[PDB]
Amino acid sequence: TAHLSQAVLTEQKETSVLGPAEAHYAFMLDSCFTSPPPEENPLVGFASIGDSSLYIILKKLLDFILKTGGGFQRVRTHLYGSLLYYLQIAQRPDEPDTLEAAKKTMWERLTA
Amino acid sequence: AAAAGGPCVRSSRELWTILLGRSALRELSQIEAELNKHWRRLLEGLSYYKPPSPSSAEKVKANKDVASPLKELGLRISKFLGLDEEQSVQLLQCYLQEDYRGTRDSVKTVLQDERQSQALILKIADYYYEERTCILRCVLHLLTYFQDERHPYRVEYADCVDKLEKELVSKYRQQFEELYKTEAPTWETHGNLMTERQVSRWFVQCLREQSMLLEIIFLYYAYFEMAPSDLLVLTKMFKEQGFGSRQTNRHLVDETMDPFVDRIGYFSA
Amino acid sequence: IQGFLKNEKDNALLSAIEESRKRTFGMAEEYHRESMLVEWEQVKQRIL
Amino acid sequence: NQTTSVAKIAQYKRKLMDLSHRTLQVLIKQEIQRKSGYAIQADEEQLRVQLDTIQGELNAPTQFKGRLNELMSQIRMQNHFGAVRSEERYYIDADLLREIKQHLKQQQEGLSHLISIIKDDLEDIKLVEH
Amino acid sequence: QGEYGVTIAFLRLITTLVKGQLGSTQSQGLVPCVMFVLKEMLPSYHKWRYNSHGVREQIGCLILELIHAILNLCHETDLHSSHTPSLQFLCICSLAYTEAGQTVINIMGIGVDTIDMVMAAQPRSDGAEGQGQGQLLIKTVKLAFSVTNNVIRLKPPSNVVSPLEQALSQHGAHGNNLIAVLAKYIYHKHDPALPRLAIQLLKRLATVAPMSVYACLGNDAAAIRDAFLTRLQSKIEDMRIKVMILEFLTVAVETQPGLIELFLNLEVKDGSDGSKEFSLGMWSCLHAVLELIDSQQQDRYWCPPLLHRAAIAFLHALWQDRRDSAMLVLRTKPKFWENLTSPLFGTLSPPSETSEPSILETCALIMKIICLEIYYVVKGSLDQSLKDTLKKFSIEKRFAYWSG
């Protein structure tokens, strides 16, 4: 679960160099202020962050946290550590406090 | 080649594309005249393609119209396919007219890099296997349609069958016996490209051709009387071979090949 | 291999705790800062 | 005699190309002959991995060779329409062209002084390094 | 389980229900079934377990037959009722904007040599409707090209490239260039419908891609040309392949400058007088165009009018788009203006008889070429066989005939 989390935690960042993850920030750099182009939402391999496999792995980990009796304390610490690394796959990164992101209105922040 | 006014001797696959009705051709006379030209390839069968000959090799050497690297590759194709030197130099020039996916001048560098020259010889083997297959497909398709009330070329196909009838099955029986008895090709006999993976693909094609020869013999005797003499010969032939199963080269059979052996078994039955 | 595959994991356990701690504590400053700025983002209209 | 020197250079660079290819074909065979019967070395697997990468870059249909073929196809088609683009020979005054020549002159004698000073200073600094 | 008996039944059911909803407002009632196919099935059926071969290929075939059915619905054009999007518009936008479109691209990306390899592997000689795995794969890949050729017919006009149109033109750095794969279908012989649907898409990427089609072929470009020209020449070829090749070469004049020189193949010479001579070289497309219009082989082989139209449309573009390095090399050809104008010396049935309108276009396009030549070649340097052809047109009173 640590290495699954570490692999998504490179995927996110190099798809933010030569992949789809930059698109909604790269489009924010155009000098377009009246009658824009349409917008479309590509993913490719980034769609796998929505698998049934990832929801099955979450269940099977919670099922094993319940099945481990109290005295298996060293098993439970590795499973709580596993669930923290799994919940890092579900982590949003740190966004930059730009004077431009601060312009995105309460409408865009509710209709994106 | 493609600047001299020579009468080009069609591939069996060009004829197959026409008889399938997948070309633009529609004239009864243009199918008649090509059937009355090509029925002898159909009546020579697989034996339309022949083994190497020193006289074929000397004609190829003495020729002035084929540029020498096409002779020198044609003589390598001749060894690698067990094929006549003139027919190898035909097959090469048909491939360089049909399926060479390059320019007329990238043919030069493919005849100067040996890594590409070997890759061209291997693609010409696969082209030879579609050619042999297409001789059989053309006869199977005549026998499928010469009696159909619906077929637009029915009369021209019947005008072909009466010109095959009295020699066809006895030669297709010989070609079946030739294919189940022949020993496997080797790196000494055919050259260094004859590795186990090409010996396998050769034997798969021999099992395809054995099953398709019987498929054509079955779809002949469904219209013409088998004599008791020839049931007695076919019973002895399939008894020796064990109904597809007892090939000379059964040391080459894998789980992808025995489905062709059962197709030989079904027609042997 | 087994001291190595201890220390990789005990560091990974500490790391899994640590970003949760230090992200929640940085989020304490920033929560006071925007709460200060949102009470100020009441007061200047009480004034105006 | 200047044009005869250009003709000498245009021969003698092409004679160095013959000799360079001959040095290379001698050294290639001497290194194969020196290491014959030995396993492939670490110096030599690194050399092949660089040469494989370079041969990839030279054959990639979007790199050098592909680009050079469309540069030719663009230049020819551009020229085919340039030879139809109709000269609109505008006027420019003789004394406007006089002051444009004088601007470009003072700019050029100024550039000549900068191209003095960078050579002046770059030879002077070599007198501190010795 | 890896087996799809209800999925195959469902895709057949929704295909029949869409084909059965022409002339009805109930098309809204299939939107959830069609969106489930476009989102949950089409992006994932290549990512599933299978127990048997050709089942995945039949699921792709049935998904693309549903999508091809949706994309060949008509609309009976009311313009005034509701604010509701049509079942076809929701399909168009799902394919333009999502992994649904990328799956259609991936199916066009399978390549010709892969289809040829499957047909070379088959234990059979398949019958005319025998759905063996190569003929099934040819159905699936034709349906993918047909779906794309309908999305790029039914996208509304807008100043915007959709990800489908962008992924049709992008250079995937660890893969094949897609346009090179689309063009390589010229080699396919086992069904002439496949190369036509590929050439119909290339005639649109040539007018919508922000990059040259010639650079997108690179090392393949001349080999693909040599193949296209061999099929344009071939006297057993599908007439509709020759039409689509000629019309793709019209668009190579209209929008793809780096691609049209390659096909014109002008072999050059130095002149005695410091000029440059241009000649129709050994791979010039114009050798085939000059045969298709030759009256003295139309004496022997009937060129059907939709194909003569396509050869004449390519000659109209070469005259419109001022391609004089080819026009000079046609003006210098014996019988050029006599053969080219020969339809203007024919006779037509009245407009109240069912004539082929490709003949009306042929005569209109020949008139455009005559107009452009007489206008550009200012009153002097015009050919004498043209000058005596206009004289013939006046002497035969063809002015009064075409007037009437």
PDB file of all heavy atoms in Angstrom, chain A residues 7-26:
ATOM      1  N   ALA A   7       3.696   5.200  -6.147  1.00  0.00           N
ATOM      2  CA  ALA A   7       3.558   5.141  -7.605  1.00  0.00           C
ATOM      3  C   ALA A   7       2.527   6.153  -8.146  1.00  0.00           C
ATOM      4  O   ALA A   7       2.823   6.881  -9.094  1.00  0.00           O
ATOM      5  CB  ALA A   7       3.221   3.700  -8.011  1.00  0.00           C
ATOM      6  N   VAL A   8       1.357   6.283  -7.506  1.00  0.00           N
ATOM      7  CA  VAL A   8       0.394   7.354  -7.838  1.00  0.00           C
ATOM      8  C   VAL A   8       1.011   8.734  -7.564  1.00  0.00           C
ATOM      9  O   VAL A   8       0.834   9.679  -8.332  1.00  0.00           O
ATOM     10  CB  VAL A   8      -0.927   7.172  -7.065  1.00  0.00           C
ATOM     11  CG1 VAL A   8      -1.919   8.313  -7.335  1.00  0.00           C
ATOM     12  CG2 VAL A   8      -1.626   5.872  -7.470  1.00  0.00           C
ATOM     13  N   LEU A   9       1.806   8.852  -6.498  1.00  0.00           N
ATOM     14  CA  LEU A   9       2.515  10.076  -6.123  1.00  0.00           C
ATOM     15  C   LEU A   9       3.765  10.375  -6.981  1.00  0.00           C
ATOM     16  O   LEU A   9       4.402  11.401  -6.725  1.00  0.00           O
ATOM     17  CB  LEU A   9       2.796  10.064  -4.605  1.00  0.00           C
ATOM     18  CG  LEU A   9       1.531  10.170  -3.722  1.00  0.00           C
ATOM     19  CD1 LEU A   9       1.876   9.851  -2.267  1.00  0.00           C
ATOM     20  CD2 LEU A   9       0.935  11.580  -3.750  1.00  0.00           C
ATOM     21  N   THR A  10       4.080   9.595  -8.022  1.00  0.00           N
ATOM     22  CA  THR A  10       4.861  10.068  -9.188  1.00  0.00           C
ATOM     23  C   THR A  10       3.972  10.292 -10.413  1.00  0.00           C
ATOM     24  O   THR A  10       4.075  11.352 -11.034  1.00  0.00           O
ATOM     25  CB  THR A  10       6.060   9.169  -9.538  1.00  0.00           C
ATOM     26  OG1 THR A  10       5.692   7.825  -9.733  1.00  0.00           O
ATOM     27  CG2 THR A  10       7.124   9.188  -8.441  1.00  0.00           C
ATOM     28  N   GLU A  11       3.023   9.387 -10.697  1.00  0.00           N
ATOM     29  CA  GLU A  11       2.055   9.490 -11.807  1.00  0.00           C
ATOM     30  C   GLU A  11       1.395  10.879 -11.881  1.00  0.00           C
ATOM     31  O   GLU A  11       1.462  11.542 -12.918  1.00  0.00           O
ATOM     32  CB  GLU A  11       0.969   8.407 -11.648  1.00  0.00           C
ATOM     33  CG  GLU A  11       0.050   8.276 -12.877  1.00  0.00           C
ATOM     34  CD  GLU A  11      -1.362   7.791 -12.505  1.00  0.00           C
ATOM     35  OE1 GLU A  11      -1.470   6.836 -11.701  1.00  0.00           O
ATOM     36  OE2 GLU A  11      -2.329   8.397 -13.022  1.00  0.00           O
ATOM     37  N   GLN A  12       0.847  11.374 -10.764  1.00  0.00           N
ATOM     38  CA  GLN A  12       0.218  12.701 -10.647  1.00  0.00           C
ATOM     39  C   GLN A  12       1.102  13.862 -11.134  1.00  0.00           C
ATOM     40  O   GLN A  12       0.605  14.895 -11.581  1.00  0.00           O
ATOM     41  CB  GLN A  12      -0.064  12.981  -9.161  1.00  0.00           C
ATOM     42  CG  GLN A  12      -1.244  12.214  -8.552  1.00  0.00           C
ATOM     43  CD  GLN A  12      -1.368  12.477  -7.049  1.00  0.00           C
ATOM     44  OE1 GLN A  12      -0.687  13.309  -6.463  1.00  0.00           O
ATOM     45  NE2 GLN A  12      -2.248  11.787  -6.361  1.00  0.00           N
ATOM     46  N   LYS A  13       2.422  13.728 -10.976  1.00  0.00           N
ATOM     47  CA  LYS A  13       3.385  14.831 -11.078  1.00  0.00           C
ATOM     48  C   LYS A  13       4.063  14.855 -12.439  1.00  0.00           C
ATOM     49  O   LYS A  13       4.319  15.934 -12.954  1.00  0.00           O
ATOM     50  CB  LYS A  13       4.387  14.742  -9.916  1.00  0.00           C
ATOM     51  CG  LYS A  13       3.664  14.900  -8.566  1.00  0.00           C
ATOM     52  CD  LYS A  13       4.573  14.598  -7.374  1.00  0.00           C
ATOM     53  CE  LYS A  13       3.701  14.445  -6.118  1.00  0.00           C
ATOM     54  NZ  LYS A  13       4.368  13.603  -5.096  1.00  0.00           N
ATOM     55  N   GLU A  14       4.257  13.695 -13.059  1.00  0.00           N
ATOM     56  CA  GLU A  14       4.815  13.579 -14.413  1.00  0.00           C
ATOM     57  C   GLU A  14       3.710  13.595 -15.493  1.00  0.00           C
ATOM     58  O   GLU A  14       3.928  14.103 -16.596  1.00  0.00           O
ATOM     59  CB  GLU A  14       5.775  12.373 -14.456  1.00  0.00           C
ATOM     60  CG  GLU A  14       6.991  12.652 -13.545  1.00  0.00           C
ATOM     61  CD  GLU A  14       7.957  11.468 -13.416  1.00  0.00           C
ATOM     62  OE1 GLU A  14       7.624  10.528 -12.656  1.00  0.00           O
ATOM     63  OE2 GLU A  14       9.052  11.543 -14.019  1.00  0.00           O
ATOM     64  N   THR A  15       2.463  13.233 -15.146  1.00  0.00           N
ATOM     65  CA  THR A  15       1.275  13.668 -15.919  1.00  0.00           C
ATOM     66  C   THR A  15       0.992  15.172 -15.790  1.00  0.00           C
ATOM     67  O   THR A  15       0.272  15.719 -16.623  1.00  0.00           O
ATOM     68  CB  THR A  15      -0.006  12.891 -15.578  1.00  0.00           C
ATOM     69  OG1 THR A  15      -0.322  13.002 -14.218  1.00  0.00           O
ATOM     70  CG2 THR A  15       0.079  11.410 -15.942  1.00  0.00           C
ATOM     71  N   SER A  16       1.618  15.853 -14.822  1.00  0.00           N
ATOM     72  CA  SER A  16       1.718  17.321 -14.718  1.00  0.00           C
ATOM     73  C   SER A  16       3.051  17.861 -15.288  1.00  0.00           C
ATOM     74  O   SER A  16       3.630  18.812 -14.759  1.00  0.00           O
ATOM     75  CB  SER A  16       1.480  17.793 -13.277  1.00  0.00           C
ATOM     76  OG  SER A  16       0.241  17.330 -12.770  1.00  0.00           O
ATOM     77  N   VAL A  17       3.563  17.187 -16.329  1.00  0.00           N
ATOM     78  CA  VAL A  17       4.685  17.607 -17.195  1.00  0.00           C
ATOM     79  C   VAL A  17       4.397  17.237 -18.660  1.00  0.00           C
ATOM     80  O   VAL A  17       4.613  18.048 -19.555  1.00  0.00           O
ATOM     81  CB  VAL A  17       6.028  16.978 -16.742  1.00  0.00           C
ATOM     82  CG1 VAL A  17       7.188  17.294 -17.699  1.00  0.00           C
ATOM     83  CG2 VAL A  17       6.478  17.464 -15.361  1.00  0.00           C
ATOM     84  N   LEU A  18       3.909  16.015 -18.925  1.00  0.00           N
ATOM     85  CA  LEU A  18       3.573  15.523 -20.278  1.00  0.00           C
ATOM     86  C   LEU A  18       2.282  14.670 -20.300  1.00  0.00           C
ATOM     87  O   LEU A  18       2.194  13.668 -21.008  1.00  0.00           O
ATOM     88  CB  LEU A  18       4.798  14.794 -20.892  1.00  0.00           C
ATOM     89  CG  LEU A  18       5.880  15.711 -21.496  1.00  0.00           C
ATOM     90  CD1 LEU A  18       7.089  14.868 -21.913  1.00  0.00           C
ATOM     91  CD2 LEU A  18       5.388  16.448 -22.747  1.00  0.00           C
ATOM     92  N   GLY A  19       1.262  15.059 -19.528  1.00  0.00           N
ATOM     93  CA  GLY A  19      -0.019  14.345 -19.454  1.00  0.00           C
ATOM     94  C   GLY A  19      -1.242  15.260 -19.303  1.00  0.00           C
ATOM     95  O   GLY A  19      -1.139  16.475 -19.466  1.00  0.00           O
ATOM     96  N   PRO A  20      -2.430  14.689 -19.029  1.00  0.00           N
ATOM     97  CA  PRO A  20      -3.688  15.438 -19.007  1.00  0.00           C
ATOM     98  C   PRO A  20      -3.895  16.296 -17.748  1.00  0.00           C
ATOM     99  O   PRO A  20      -4.719  17.207 -17.782  1.00  0.00           O
ATOM    100  CB  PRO A  20      -4.778  14.369 -19.140  1.00  0.00           C
ATOM    101  CG  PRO A  20      -4.155  13.133 -18.495  1.00  0.00           C
ATOM    102  CD  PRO A  20      -2.679  13.261 -18.865  1.00  0.00           C
ATOM    103  N   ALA A  21      -3.174  16.030 -16.654  1.00  0.00           N
ATOM    104  CA  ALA A  21      -3.429  16.640 -15.345  1.00  0.00           C
ATOM    105  C   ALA A  21      -3.167  18.161 -15.303  1.00  0.00           C
ATOM    106  O   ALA A  21      -3.759  18.871 -14.490  1.00  0.00           O
ATOM    107  CB  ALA A  21      -2.584  15.889 -14.308  1.00  0.00           C
ATOM    108  N   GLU A  22      -2.330  18.677 -16.204  1.00  0.00           N
ATOM    109  CA  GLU A  22      -2.020  20.109 -16.301  1.00  0.00           C
ATOM    110  C   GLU A  22      -3.128  20.929 -17.001  1.00  0.00           C
ATOM    111  O   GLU A  22      -3.192  22.149 -16.839  1.00  0.00           O
ATOM    112  CB  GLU A  22      -0.666  20.252 -17.015  1.00  0.00           C
ATOM    113  CG  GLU A  22       0.003  21.607 -16.757  1.00  0.00           C
ATOM    114  CD  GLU A  22       1.362  21.685 -17.460  1.00  0.00           C
ATOM    115  OE1 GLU A  22       2.323  21.089 -16.920  1.00  0.00           O
ATOM    116  OE2 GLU A  22       1.417  22.337 -18.527  1.00  0.00           O
ATOM    117  N   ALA A  23      -4.027  20.297 -17.769  1.00  0.00           N
ATOM    118  CA  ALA A  23      -4.870  20.975 -18.763  1.00  0.00           C
ATOM    119  C   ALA A  23      -5.725  22.131 -18.203  1.00  0.00           C
ATOM    120  O   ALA A  23      -5.728  23.229 -18.767  1.00  0.00           O
ATOM    121  CB  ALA A  23      -5.737  19.916 -19.456  1.00  0.00           C
ATOM    122  N   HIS A  24      -6.393  21.932 -17.062  1.00  0.00           N
ATOM    123  CA  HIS A  24      -7.255  22.935 -16.404  1.00  0.00           C
ATOM    124  C   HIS A  24      -6.487  24.098 -15.742  1.00  0.00           C
ATOM    125  O   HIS A  24      -7.099  25.034 -15.213  1.00  0.00           O
ATOM    126  CB  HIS A  24      -8.151  22.231 -15.379  1.00  0.00           C
ATOM    127  CG  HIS A  24      -8.873  21.030 -15.932  1.00  0.00           C
ATOM    128  ND1 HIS A  24      -8.348  19.739 -15.961  1.00  0.00           N
ATOM    129  CD2 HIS A  24     -10.114  21.022 -16.500  1.00  0.00           C
ATOM    130  CE1 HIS A  24      -9.289  18.975 -16.533  1.00  0.00           C
ATOM    131  NE2 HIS A  24     -10.360  19.718 -16.861  1.00  0.00           N
ATOM    132  N   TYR A  25      -5.153  24.043 -15.780  1.00  0.00           N
ATOM    133  CA  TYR A  25      -4.231  25.084 -15.328  1.00  0.00           C
ATOM    134  C   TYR A  25      -3.483  25.708 -16.515  1.00  0.00           C
ATOM    135  O   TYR A  25      -3.362  26.928 -16.566  1.00  0.00           O
ATOM    136  CB  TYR A  25      -3.285  24.498 -14.271  1.00  0.00           C
ATOM    137  CG  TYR A  25      -4.026  23.916 -13.082  1.00  0.00           C
ATOM    138  CD1 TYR A  25      -4.340  22.541 -13.050  1.00  0.00           C
ATOM    139  CD2 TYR A  25      -4.455  24.760 -12.037  1.00  0.00           C
ATOM    140  CE1 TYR A  25      -5.095  22.013 -11.987  1.00  0.00           C
ATOM    141  CE2 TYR A  25      -5.207  24.233 -10.968  1.00  0.00           C
ATOM    142  CZ  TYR A  25      -5.535  22.861 -10.949  1.00  0.00           C
ATOM    143  OH  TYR A  25      -6.288  22.367  -9.933  1.00  0.00           O
ATOM    144  N   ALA A  26      -3.092  24.916 -17.519  1.00  0.00           N
ATOM    145  CA  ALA A  26      -2.530  25.407 -18.778  1.00  0.00           C
ATOM    146  C   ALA A  26      -3.523  26.295 -19.556  1.00  0.00           C
ATOM    147  O   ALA A  26      -3.151  27.366 -20.032  1.00  0.00           O
ATOM    148  CB  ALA A  26      -2.084  24.199 -19.611  1.00  0.00           C
TER     149      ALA A  26
END
